[PDB]
Write an enzyme that holds these catalytic residues in place. Structure first.
Site, mmCIF file in Angstrom:
data_model
loop_
_atom_site.group_PDB
_atom_site.id
_atom_site.type_symbol
_atom_site.label_atom_id
_atom_site.label_comp_id
_atom_site.label_asym_id
_atom_site.label_seq_id
_atom_site.Cartn_x
_atom_site.Cartn_y
_atom_site.Cartn_z
ATOM 1 C CB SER A 1 -11.857 45.513 -2.773
ATOM 2 O OG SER A 1 -12.784 46.376 -2.151
ATOM 3 C CD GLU B 1 -25.635 47.657 -1.770
ATOM 4 O OE1 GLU B 1 -24.856 47.837 -2.737
ATOM 5 O OE2 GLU B 1 -26.404 48.554 -1.335
HETATM 6 C C1 ZZ7 Z 1 -12.301 49.478 0.367
HETATM 7 C C2 ZZ7 Z 1 -12.765 48.712 1.603
HETATM 8 C C3 ZZ7 Z 1 -12.309 49.432 2.868
HETATM 9 S S1 ZZ7 Z 1 -14.598 48.497 1.616
HETATM 10 C C4 ZZ7 Z 1 -14.560 47.187 0.327
HETATM 11 C C5 ZZ7 Z 1 -15.564 46.035 0.605
HETATM 12 N N1 ZZ7 Z 1 -15.441 45.633 1.998
HETATM 13 C C6 ZZ7 Z 1 -16.343 46.026 2.908
HETATM 14 O O1 ZZ7 Z 1 -17.321 46.721 2.624
HETATM 15 C C7 ZZ7 Z 1 -16.105 45.553 4.349
HETATM 16 N N2 ZZ7 Z 1 -17.355 45.689 5.076
HETATM 17 C C8 ZZ7 Z 1 -14.986 46.374 5.004
HETATM 18 C C9 ZZ7 Z 1 -13.793 45.751 5.338
HETATM 19 C C10 ZZ7 Z 1 -12.758 46.457 5.932
HETATM 20 C C11 ZZ7 Z 1 -12.917 47.807 6.196
HETATM 21 C C12 ZZ7 Z 1 -14.108 48.439 5.862
HETATM 22 C C13 ZZ7 Z 1 -15.144 47.733 5.267
HETATM 23 C C14 ZZ7 Z 1 -15.141 44.946 -0.351
HETATM 24 O O2 ZZ7 Z 1 -14.362 44.034 0.025
HETATM 25 O O3 ZZ7 Z 1 -15.545 44.974 -1.538
HETATM 26 N N3 ZZ7 Z 1 -12.947 46.488 0.472
HETATM 27 C C15 ZZ7 Z 1 -12.230 47.130 1.573
HETATM 28 C C16 ZZ7 Z 1 -10.826 47.061 1.217
HETATM 29 O O4 ZZ7 Z 1 -10.540 46.414 0.178
HETATM 30 O O5 ZZ7 Z 1 -9.942 47.615 1.931
#
Ligand code: ZZ7
EC number: 3.5.2.6
Length: 266
Positions: free
Chosen positions: A45, A143
């Site tokens: 993220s 993704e």
């Molecule tokens: C917003 C999210 C909860 S989902 C998004 C994504 N990460 C995921 O989809 C992971 N599978 C995930 C990590 C922790 C909790 C839930 C999902 C990313 O890094 O872009 N980043 C996480 C975050 O930054 O807290």
């Protein structure tokens, strides 16, 4: 300066069981600390910070872009969209989506803004335009968060993240009003209390953006920090690990940030 902390960084990543990449620059003295800083790490993220910067950049050419209302259907909602799901029945402005992407890592908001920019290539093109040749965004939420070992998709390096963050928050990559809006969004982030923010004194101002792929022990944080009465510091801390089930560690990111600041002389 890197030598002062090269051995404790190696010991920190050995306790973590993965790889840690760190780059930090004192904008006053120009000193830098570098550990695996040119290796690629998944953005997770943390791309959403640069996404908001790209929206601000466009708003310099497009009058009123930030106040444009964006309506979306429920099919635009993706998991972990804590802000945009509360405004599904009403919509939100571009500026509100941008703040949600930065301060709450709102996934639906990020995808909505990506679409306005022309998708992952549009954001990559923005980073190319400020001189970042390392950044690449390839996919959308969720993704892009697969964090597969050796996969260059959706990655950058700690050094390139830090250099770009510096240009956007302290340099001339953004016009003065847009630059301050970017800084204020970063300063209002709610997701980073246990990462770089846990490493700095209570009286320092901090703007940061976190990322958490979760799988493969992959998480990160980047920040501009203002020591009181002193020149700002810019730093990026990225982690990954070899096994899909390896867990990420906020404590490790804070500890790496502490070492980087110690290495800079603070
Ligand atoms: C917003 C999210 C909860 S989902 C998004 C994504 N990460 C995921 O989809 C992971 N599978 C995930 C990590 C922790 C909790 C839930 C999902 C990313 O890094 O872009 N980043 C996480 C975050 O930054 O807290």
């Amino acid at each position: 300066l890197t030598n002062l902390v090269a051995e404790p960084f190696a010991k920190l990543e050995q306790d973590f069981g993965g790889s840690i990449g760190v780059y930090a620059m004192d904008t006053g003295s120009g000193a830098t600390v570098s550990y695996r800083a040119e290796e690629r790490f998944p953005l997770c993220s943390s791309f959403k910070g640069f996404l908001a910067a790209a929206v601000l950049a466009r708003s310099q050419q497009q009058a009123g872009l930030l106040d444009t209302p964006i309506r979306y259907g429920k099919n635009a909602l993706v998991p972990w969209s804590p802000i945009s799901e509360k405004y599904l029945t009403t919509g939100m402005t571009v500026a509100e989506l941008s703040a949600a992407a930065v301060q709450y890592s709102d996934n639906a908001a990020a995808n909505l803004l990506l679409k306005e920019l022309g998708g992952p290539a549009g954001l990559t093109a923005f980073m190319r335009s400020i001189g970042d040749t390392t950044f690449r965004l390839d996919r959308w939420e969720l993704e892009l968060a697969s964090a597969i070992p050796g996969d260059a998709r959706d990655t950058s390096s700690p050094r390139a993240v830090t250099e770009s963050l510096q240009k956007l928050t302290l340099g001339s990559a953004l016009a003065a009003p847009q630059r301050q809006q970017f800084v204020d969004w970063l300063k209002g982030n709610t997701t980073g209390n246990h990462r770089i923010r846990a490493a700095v004194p209570a009286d320092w101002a901090v703007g940061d953006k976190t990322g958490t792929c979760g799988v493969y022990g992959t998480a990160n944080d980047y920040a501009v920090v203002w020591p009181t009465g002193r020149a700002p510091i810019v730093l990026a801390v990225y982690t990954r690990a070899p096994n899909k089930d390896d867990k990420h560690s906020e404590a490790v990111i804070a500890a790496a940030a502490r070492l980087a600041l110690e290495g800079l002389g603070v």
